[PDB]
């Protein structure tokens, strides 16, 4: 199909910058960063967004402006304004069902309680879009990853989050380039 868009989830504010529900953007600053490109208002969906390309593909990295829940509201004016269709749109996500630093490739299967992502399939209308999940861990046999996804990570876990965030950052621009996974060893 053609035009790509990767989007980085996360929540406002510079104090929601460094949690764990905020790795998205930080990969997403990263891949930017890398590719030599700022972000910039985007007036017509309201998220900000980054121009450049990843090996001569053409890229639209983005960042969602509002909070975490209405992620959809947004990205799914992204696609539409860029003709993106969802099995070309890559969300990059903090996943509770993984564990802290491991990171896998897929399209389809579900949200793992990721509320960010419902909203994405929802306004998608679709759960095949692909994800690069980062694992971050998952608060203890019984719940509450709600609050858990709004700390920080601990100061063992933020010495490797740089780490993490560069393997991360490689597999998005792998999926681009070649698709599929075997960027998936074991950071267990």
Known sequence: AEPLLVVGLGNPGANY?????????????????????????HKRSGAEVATGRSAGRSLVLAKPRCYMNESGRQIGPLAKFYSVAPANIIVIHDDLDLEFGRIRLKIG???GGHN??????????????????????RPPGRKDPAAFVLENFTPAERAEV?????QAADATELLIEQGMEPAQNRVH
């Open 17 to 41: 910058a460094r949690t764990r529900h905020n790795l998205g953007f930080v990969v997403a600053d990263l891949l930017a960063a890398r590719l030599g490109a700022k972000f910039k208002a």
């Open 162 to 166: 740089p780490t993490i965030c560069e």
């Open 109 to 111: 299967g579900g949200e």
């Open 116 to 137: 960010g992502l419902r909203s994405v399939v929802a306004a998608l209308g679709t759960k095949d879009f692909q994800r690069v999940r980062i694992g971050i861990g």
